[model samples]
Target: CSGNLFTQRTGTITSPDYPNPYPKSSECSYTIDLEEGFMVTLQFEDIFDIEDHPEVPCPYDYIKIKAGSKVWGPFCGEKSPEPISTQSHSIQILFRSDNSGENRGWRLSYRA
Candidate 1:
């Protein structure tokens, strides 16, 4: 689904039906924009869980982050990623799920 254009300097982003299993075959994009000269920093909560593959990372469901020239994750696992401080004032967070799996999904926060 088309996510949101978030202008807030600090806020949280969560998966649809979060705290519960996310829906199958879903795609969502969250965009964070801030004033010039301020970059975006991101961190995830401990409750993160997403569908993943044993041999290949994030083959089923994943969260990807993009900030200017930098890209981080295609991440899917029980563990959360480390905090990131990106170089740009705008960021894009993408979440995609395949046709199956039971995952409570993820929650994350961002600040400029």
Candidate 2:
């Protein structure tokens, strides 16, 4: 999943195989360039499963976050990620996984 995406104020992004184990070697990306004064409330939910061997807490099925030069983290694990908010007018979301390991997918709620 990669491209420019928009909505009428709010929405959600479910894993490719959400509610089911996602396929391997997956790559997902998103760019949220909203209108002025608009803010985005992103809430991560469900399983944050990634089958990567991982590096401490960063690799495997990872969610690398980018928002207008703002940096919180690119995270993955069994534990749920902390909620995220946009800092600039544009926000970026990317999810990258490998063909190894598998787990229930994830979902994120967005409100602006």
Candidate 3:
């Protein structure tokens, strides 16, 4: 699921296959763009899940965000992450998985 997302106001994003376990050794990228005056905000759903490492944080499967000059996450684990509000009209997301761990993935929604 790698592509550009242009929504009127809100949209949903999820890892490929959704409720099923995600594939191994995958890299997915998404870019969300909206009107000039809008800022983007994203929140994970309750069903969030990603492969994680207890000692090394998200060293396996994770998602990353980029907005303007700032960046957030490489976030992983079973818990849903905190909401993300971006200062720009556009945002980029990158999801990556190592060669192992076919864990269930993540679901999130975005609004501008």
Candidate 4:
């Protein structure tokens, strides 16, 4: 919280099914230019594989990290089947402004 508000949160990517992987981490920074006290919500979106196989189409992938929380299930819902391969995932972060003064802030962290 001291080293330039720009470099605040850090994220790391990991795939337990992947073998011998490096550079599984990433840093996320943000800045807030607000007028006064405000409130906002952060949303993180990412896709997760369900199955462990590598010979299927789409392979039953599901969505996670929605509305600042972790949710897991079948491909689309509770009735979907498990995925084939849970690798090479992608993530996106979004900030929703509820007030005029609402600004930016960091959620994730990393080590030196």
Candidate 5:
């Protein structure tokens, strides 16, 4: 969809190379935007690889999901988190990958 989504009741967002190994050094930022008077919910149905350290979870590869300006995660490693929801008109989701490793991409759906 659009880097920003609008006017959709329901939809999904995935890494560029999903269900397979994503390419190295890729950056795909996401913002699940909805219409006014609508709230958004995000679910990570399938998750794969990401390389990060304690210094920064997004060291190598990462996805950052935001609830309004106050966000939650810039997650990494092999584990995935729970669903996300936002009352704002737009929720930002950023996908950034370093040049070294390629991981099996992720699957996430959004509802407005």
Candidate 6:
């Protein structure tokens, strides 16, 4: 099955070396451009449960999108956060994996 979130620009995913004594969490970053006087909504879905794994599903701990000096959200205040408005600029999406054993990836979608 395809990932729930769709994107115009392909995103990047990386995996840490296996068997390492200490391994850090994997991450994905995507840059999107927004038009002036427009709002952008980014949605991340948890798909660990959809995977054919016996392990418990892991929730997304946090998500941050920044444009220059302004930052948007950790998006943890609610079960699902809403869109954010911003002027024309490039925004960076920083996401961290919740559970090491879970899917360890996210599906992201944005509308402006």
Q: lDDT of each model, Cα atoms only?
A: 0.88, 0.72, 0.86, 0.25, 0.73, 0.44
Question: Which segments of model 5 are wrong by more than 4 Å?
Answer: 1-6
Residue lDDT tens for model 1, 13-99: 998888899989888888888888988889997599998898998976999999888899999889989998887788988999988
Q: Candidate 3 on 1-112: residue-level lDDT in tens?
A: 7775756678988888999998888789888888888988999985878999978979769999999899999898888779988967888999999888778999889988
Give lDDT tens digits, candidate 2, residues 23-91.
777788877667878888788876666554534665757777677677656666676678887755567
TM-scores of the candidates in the order shown: 0.94, 0.84, 0.92, 0.19, 0.83, 0.46
Query: Model 1 Cα displacement at 87 (Å)?
Result: 2.5
Off by over 4 Å in 4: 1-25, 48-112
Give me candidate 1's TM-score against the actual structure: 0.94
Instruction: Summarize candidate 4's per-residue lDDT along 1-112 as a digit string, tens digits.
Output: 1123322233332322222221112122233222233222222223322222256432223223221133232122213233212111222322221122211221222211
Minimal lDDT window, size 10, model 3: 1-10
Ranking 2 against 5 by lDDT, winner: 5
RMSD of each: 1.1, 1.9, 1.3, 16.7, 2.3, 9.2
Q: Is candidate 1 or candidate 3 better by TM-score?
A: 1
lDDT of model 1, residue 22: 92
- Give me the overall lDDT of model 5: 0.73
lDDT per residue as tens, model 5, 13-93:
787768777777777876665677788877788765677667744766888877757786777778777877677667777
Model 2's lDDT to the true fold? Answer: 0.72
After superposing candidate 6, which stretches have Cα over 4 Å from the reference?
A: 1-24, 34-60, 98-108
Better of 3 and 4 by lDDT: 3
Among these predictions, the greatest TM-score belongs to 1
- Residue 45 alpha-carbon offset, candidate 5, angstroms: 0.6
| Model 5 superposed RMSD (Cα) | 2.3
